[PDB]
Amino acid sequence: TKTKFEKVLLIVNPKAGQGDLHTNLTKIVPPLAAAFPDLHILHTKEQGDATKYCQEFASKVDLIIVFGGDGTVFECTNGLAPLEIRPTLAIIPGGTCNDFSRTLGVPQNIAEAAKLITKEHVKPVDVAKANGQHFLNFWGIGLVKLGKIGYYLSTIETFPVKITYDGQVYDEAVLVMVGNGEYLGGIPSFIPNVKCDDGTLDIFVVKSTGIQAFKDYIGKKLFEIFHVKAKSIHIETEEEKEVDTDGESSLHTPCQIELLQGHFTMIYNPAV
Amino acid sequence: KTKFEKVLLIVNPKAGQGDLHTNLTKIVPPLAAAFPDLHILHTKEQGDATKYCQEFASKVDLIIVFGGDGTVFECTNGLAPLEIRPTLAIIPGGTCNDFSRTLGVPQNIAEAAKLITKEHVKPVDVAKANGQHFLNFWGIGLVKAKLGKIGYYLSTIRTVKNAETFPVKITYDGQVYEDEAVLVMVGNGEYLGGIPSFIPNVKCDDGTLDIFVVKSTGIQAFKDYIGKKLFEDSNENDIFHVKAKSIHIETEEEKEVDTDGESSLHTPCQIELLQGHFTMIYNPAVV
Amino acid sequence: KTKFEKVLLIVNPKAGQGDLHTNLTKIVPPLAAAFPDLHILHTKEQGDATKYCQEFASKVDLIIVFGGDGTVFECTNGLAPLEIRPTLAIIPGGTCNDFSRTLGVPQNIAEAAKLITKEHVKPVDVAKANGQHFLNFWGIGLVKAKLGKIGYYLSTIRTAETFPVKITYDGQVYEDEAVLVMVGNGEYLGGIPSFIPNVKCDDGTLDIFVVKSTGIQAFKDYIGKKLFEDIFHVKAKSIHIETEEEKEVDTDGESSLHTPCQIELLQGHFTMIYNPAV
Amino acid sequence: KTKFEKVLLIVNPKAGQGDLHTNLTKIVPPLAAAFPDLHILHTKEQGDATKYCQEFASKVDLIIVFGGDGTVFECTNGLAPLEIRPTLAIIPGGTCNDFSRTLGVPQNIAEAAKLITKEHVKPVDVAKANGQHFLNFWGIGLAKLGKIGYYLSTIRTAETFPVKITYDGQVYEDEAVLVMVGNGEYLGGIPSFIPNVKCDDGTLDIFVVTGIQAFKDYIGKKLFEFHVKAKSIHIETEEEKEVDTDGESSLHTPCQIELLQGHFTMIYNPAVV
Ligand SMILES: [Mg+2]
Ligand SMILES: [Mg+2]
Ligand SMILES: [Mg+2]
Ligand SMILES: [Mg+2]
């Protein structure tokens, strides 16, 4: 009888998933409808809808479930992050990449993902903020389907960078990452020992001299390159560089990056 | 374009062969696929469906009820008195489901759900008896596991022996009828007890109700009448049948009235026809 | 603290004997000061108050109506049939305002508003006649006056048709030839105390009151005297009224009700703001 | 033929110069007369106006705030990040009320309420500094009278710090005593000491001040004609410096400041502005 979630919202991207909407809904809705006696299901129609729905329902609902890929999850992130009241968020993975779902240990089988939600295991998750843009997975320069990070990793120029991190300063670089999530491009993060709930972000720079070392590092796929953890980060380049992040964005250097500890609460899989 | 921007589905979890998860697998996905704004509320107690209808009537364009006669009756009593009444649809989740049958709704719950997505809607008359609303019927003289009140009565009418008589005064559209009776029905719906109405030529959307009385003396005549399955007006002393819009029914002593579901209604009764008071999802392939 | 977390004020803009702005200057500020969640809706057409009551019944803890007998009746018909019925209060905005007077509400609208902020609440009986609810009265034989049905009747009674009536009340019967048949719930009729004696709106019972065909002159003198003490008069909970031919019934506002009638009482069906000083 | 089917009035009960009842007698009746669907919510705590704006943004067409600079700032921070942002109006209930003055709103609260009923609306720019939004200003080197009001009252009787300002692909490095980025046309209850600032021109005004004495004389002899206009600004200091803005905030350098052109629509007074 003792649920955490009196009212639930399921946001459905109809274009998400393998094919039939009906088939996808046959897999994900019945378990949710059985478990949650007040369930509201809204389809998105256009880019931005998920963001709008999150903003409208944030104060009316206790759990928001998003069925969609990285892009839809990012819309939800941007929708809830700036709000004072932020209900618990859950992901049913409906893209091909689904990075943050994997960080939470969510099964890629959508029926199982739905079933998981009904178990109501919830944990705090850190949300990053770069010049007012929020992100869950990563921030990166030098990355530029499978997605931006996925394509970069499947197929893996110099510029100077000045990074100010928690009172300390840091060269000529090829790749600069700030990681929050534990998976990137559908596989465990190539940035070592990243945690999404440890109150800190992981800076990761591949140097000018380290191009070959980095190629081998990604291949061997066993991690433990300049790498440091930090809460408050400022990243500067010689000229304005376009930044890549969880989804479509207009962000560019220079950047103040800041970590919001436990900003979201999210459904996760404690078995994994 | 859809007629229904926002939809509410009220689920009685006890409804159906009972298995919630299985039932929801059958009914929800087609609805969720068709209707991009769908709200699903489970009832917990008697009266919840009525409350939900009353809270959502002004917020929603379609209300779907998954339940048996009792839950449908709760919805009837919820929406009927309101000024704004969205369209109502039934997924039949009991064993009887009289009004669903009147609307030609398939008893296969998946197919009932699919029907709703076709959005065929018609006006339906709602009767009002002393402020109680009903869709199927009003009756006196109907009174171990239940086919429903009317269904059980029809199954045992043949082998039930000594029925009690009572006097009745019926005022119908400025005419009066007074006699000793065993059964008095006022029918709105076209099915009673799971089969076509024994009251002849009843229509739920013709702007009028059907009065149907068996005299104290007409027990045998009525048994034969049902067996004959010839639902027409026998020019029969024992059976009185007339159509009327505005009806008042009086008995010597207060008698408990039977209707679509659980109710506290009793005689005397003002019964009133509200023409096209509801709009409801129906099956034009059958009705 | 407060009984009322959320409040709705329904304003009939045509109500009051002064413009909208002046009326709102008198009634809104005290309410806004007292109630930190206040929603104000103006009616535009007949029926709106009914609709607003039905939409907000489940969202709000108090509903205040600023209007005359007609607007109050729209609220009565809006809330009465619902399962959830918040507390109702009246700011008197007509000329008659019968039920506001029953509750002891001052006719000064600023004072009526102030009263609501004191949050004195009592159960009130609501009558039900063939599914029509009423707060004040039900009557037959009441046949450009803005004084209201009863008010106009009382003003012109000085200078009628008889009809037979059969009244069944709580297992007793009364038949006779009559000129006026009233069933009273409220304590004021036509802007003055009820001519039916000792009527109470919260005593769990209704007052039947019949003026016989022989008592026309006696009744005219009785009204002139304005004595209003204990014509056939009895209290009853469950009443059935029959006439020879269908007669049109008069009640709180516009209605299509007619005899024969089952009249029934719903004890404490509403809770309402009242004035315990009066 | 109204622009506003549904209206929300957010009241700070502590706002205004006398009793709440008196204040409500002045502001509510004109609004209630003009707007047939009016919802009035009192704040109880810091943050409530922000929460109310966020809850009602999608339910309402106009949000009126009765309060000072701090309450207005709560509304700014409430609406600015949202996708759907109804029109905002100010009834000035503090002593400073800078942005209300930018919009030409009379300081007489009854007249401010009446203005709203005329429904004159214009786009207004909102600035964004590291995800904090502001309407009036951003600054380093600044009872109270408010941050700017107190600063101006005590300026008669300071520290220097290095600053790097990147503005629309140009750079400015120097040692400074005061750095302002202005959006609003009034600061500290009087016209902006930053010259020719406009809240709706699509651009922000950078204003930096060796110039301690020159600045003291400038404020005294209020002539008002390093100062430049820019849309996209980055401000860096040697060490993290606390930033001052419209109300209470945790903002600090370094800062990306961005202008969002016509981000809000707001009730204004075309007889004055
Ligand atoms: Mg981490
Ligand atoms: Mg019919
Ligand atoms: Mg009484
Ligand atoms: Mg400007």
* A97 shares its domain with A185: no
**A258, closest residue in chain D (CA to CA):** D130
Using an 8 Å CB-CB cutoff, list chain C residues near B250: 240, 260
Q: What does the CA dihedral C163, C168, C172, C173 come to, rounded to 10 degrees?
A: 30
Confirm or reject contact between D58 and chain A (CB < 8 A). yes
- Backbone phi, psi, residue A35, to 5°: -80, -35
* D174 shares its domain with D237: yes
* D230 shares its domain with D155: yes
Could you identify the residue written with the tokens 């639902």? B231
Distance CA B14, CA C197 (A): 53
Rounded to 5°, the CA angle C93-C99-C100 comes to 50
Find out whether D65 and D72 touch, Cβ atoms under 8 Å: yes
CA distances from A225 to A140, A164, A214, C17, C188 (A): 15, 17, 7, 83, 90
Confirm or reject contact between B55 and chain C (CB < 8 A). yes
Distance C185 CA to ligand 3 centre (A): 5
In-domain check, residue B287: no
Distance CA B175, CA B219 (A): 25
Q: Pairing state of beta strands A38-43 and A8-12?
A: parallel
CA distances from C264 to B41, C138, C186, C203, D189 (A): 34, 11, 15, 14, 67
CA distances from C89 to C10, C38, C135, D64 (A): 10, 14, 13, 28
Question: What subunits make at least 3 CB pairs under 8 angstroms with B?
Answer: A, C
In-domain check, residue D273: no
| Residue C45 tokens, joined | 């057409």
Q: Pairing state of beta strands D255-267 and C232-236?
A: unpaired
* A221 shares its domain with A167: yes
DSSP, res D122: E
Using an 8 Å CB-CB cutoff, list chain D residues near A234: 254
- Backbone phi, psi, residue A247, to 5°: -150, -170
**C59, closest residue in chain B (CA to CA):** B55
Distance CA C203, CA C215 (A): 29
For residue D49, count CB atoms less than 10 angstroms from its CB and return exposed for 0-12, middle for 13-18, buried for 19 or more: buried
Using an 8 Å CB-CB cutoff, list chain C residues near B132: 131
In-domain check, residue B138: yes
Q: Which of A34, A37, A41 sits opposite B21 (nearest CB)?
A: A34
Distance CA D78, CA D90 (A): 14
Where does chain C have alpha helices with state H?
20-34, 48-56, 69-79, 98-102, 109-116, 149-156, 216-225
Find out whether A18 and A45 touch, Cβ atoms under 8 Å: no
Nearest in space to C167 (alpha carbons), one of C250, C248, C239, C233: C239
Distance CA C9, CA C65 (A): 6
Distance CA B57, CA B38 (A): 14
Cβ atoms < 10 Å from Cβ of B26: 22
Residue D104's region, left for phi above 0, alpha for psi from -120 to 50, else beta, is: left
Cβ atoms < 10 Å from Cβ of D1: 3
CATH code (residue A48): 3.40.50.10330
Cβ atoms < 10 Å from Cβ of A271: 9
Who's near D85: CB < 8 A, 6+ residues apart? D57, D79, D263, D264, D265
The helix (H) or strand (E) run that includes residue B121 is strand B121-129
From the candidates C5, C246, C254, C264, give the one annotated as an active-site residue.
C254
Distance B187 CA to ligand 2 centre (A): 7
| Number of alpha carbons in the 13 Å side-chain half-sphere of residue B270 | 21
Who's near D88: CB < 8 A, 6+ residues apart? D62, D63, D64, D65, D75, D79, D264, D265, D266, D267
DSSP, res D252: B
Could you identify the residue written with the tokens 């999530």? A181
Residue type, D264: F
DSSP, res A84: S
* D64 shares its domain with D133: no
D 6-35 → C contacts, CB under 8 A:
11, 13, 20-21, 24-25, 28-30, 32-33
Q: Assign B117 to helix, strand or coil.
A: coil
Cβ atoms < 10 Å from Cβ of A75: 27
Find out whether C183 and C126 touch, Cβ atoms under 8 Å: no
Nearest in space to A36 (alpha carbons), one of D134, B24, B111: B24
DSSP string, B151-173: HHHHHHTTT---PPPEEEEEEET
Residue type, D41: L
Distance CA D35, CA D117 (A): 8
CB contact (8 A) between residue C39 and residue D36: no
**Considering Cα of C251, then C257, then C261, then C265, what sign does the dihedral take?**
negative
Residue numbering of the annotated binding site of A for Mg(2+): 195, 198, 200, 202
Distance from CA of C103 to the nearest CA of B (A): 27
Q: Assign B217 to helix, strand or coil.
A: coil
Nearest in space to A184 (alpha carbons), one of A149, A134, A143, A135: A149
DSSP string, A43-61: E--STTHHHHHHHHHTTT-
Cβ atoms < 10 Å from Cβ of D261: 13
From the candidates D5, D74, D248, D258, give the one annotated as an active-site residue.
D248
* C226 shares its domain with C161: yes
CA distances from A114 to A11, A38, C76 (A): 13, 16, 47
Nearest in space to D79 (alpha carbons), one of D252, D260, D238: D260
Could you identify the residue written with the tokens 């006398």? D18
- Backbone phi, psi, residue D168, to 5°: 45, 55
Nearest in space to D199 (alpha carbons), one of D211, D181, D217, D178: D181
Distance CA C117, CA D159 (A): 56
Rounded to 5°, the CA angle B121-B126-B127 comes to 165
Distance CA D114, CA D122 (A): 17
Residue type, D147: K
CA-based max dimension of chain D: 58
* C139 shares its domain with C109: no
Q: Assign C160 to helix, strand or coil.
A: coil
Find out whether C94 and C277 touch, Cβ atoms under 8 Å: no
Task: Give resolution in angstroms.
Answer: 2.5
Cβ atoms < 10 Å from Cβ of A187: 14
| Residue B65 tokens, joined | 């009820």
Distance CA C158, CA C104 (A): 29
DSSP, res D181: E
Domain count, chain C: 2
Find out whether C65 and C22 touch, Cβ atoms under 8 Å: no
- Backbone phi, psi, residue B189, to 5°: -85, 165
* C138 shares its domain with C122: no
Q: Pairing state of beta strands D62-67 and D87-92?
A: parallel
**End-to-end alpha carbon distance in chain C:** 24
Per the document, the length of chain B is: 287
Find out whether A180 and A187 touch, Cβ atoms under 8 Å: no
Distance CA D257, CA A254 (A): 11
CB contact (8 A) between residue D28 and residue C30: no
Range of the domain at D142: 127-261
Residue type, A240: E
Q: Which of A48, A85, A254 sits opposite D83 (nearest CB)?
A: A48
| Number of alpha carbons in the 13 Å side-chain half-sphere of residue A146 | 13
Distance CA D207, CA D178 (A): 8
* A153 shares its domain with A252: yes
Confirm or reject contact between D238 and chain C (CB < 8 A). no
- For the CA of C123, the nearest ligand: 3
| Residue D142 tokens, joined | 């600044």
CB contact (8 A) between residue C30 and residue D21: yes
* B137 shares its domain with B118: no
Cβ atoms < 10 Å from Cβ of C3: 12
Using an 8 Å CB-CB cutoff, list chain C residues near D42: 36-37
DSSP string, A158-206: -EEEEEEETTEE--EEEEEEEE-SSEETTEE-SSTT--TTSS-EEEEEE
Who's near A123: CB < 8 A, 6+ residues apart? A197, A265, A266, A268
* D122 shares its domain with D1: yes
Find out whether B4 and B37 touch, Cβ atoms under 8 Å: no
C264 labelled catalytic: no
DSSP, res A253: S
Distance CA D66, CA C2 (A): 24
**End-to-end alpha carbon distance in chain D:** 24
Distance CA C109, CA C111 (A): 5
Distance CA B55, CA B42 (A): 14
* C205 shares its domain with C80: no
Distance CA B146, CA B95 (A): 9
Find out whether C114 and C105 touch, Cβ atoms under 8 Å: no
DSSP string, C22-84: HHHHHHHHHHHHH-SEEEEEE--STTHHHHHHHHHTTT-SEEEEEE-HHHHHHHHHHHTTSSS
CATH code (residue C187): 2.60.200.40
- SS3 letters for C77-96? HHHCCCCCCCEEEEEECCCC
Rounded to 5°, the CA angle B113-B118-B123 comes to 95
| Residue B183 tokens, joined | 């059964």
Where does D57-136 have alpha helices with state H?
69-79, 98-102, 109-118
Residue A69's region, left for phi above 0, alpha for psi from -120 to 50, else beta, is: beta
| Residue A72 tokens, joined | 């839809």
For residue C22, count CB atoms less than 10 angstroms from its CB and return exposed for 0-12, middle for 13-18, buried for 19 or more: middle
- For the CA of A128, the nearest ligand: 1
Please, which experimental method was used? Answer: X-ray
| Residue C122 tokens, joined | 């009592």
CA distances from B66 to A140, B132, C82, D256 (A): 51, 21, 22, 55
Q: Pairing state of beta strands B269-281 and C7-11?
A: unpaired
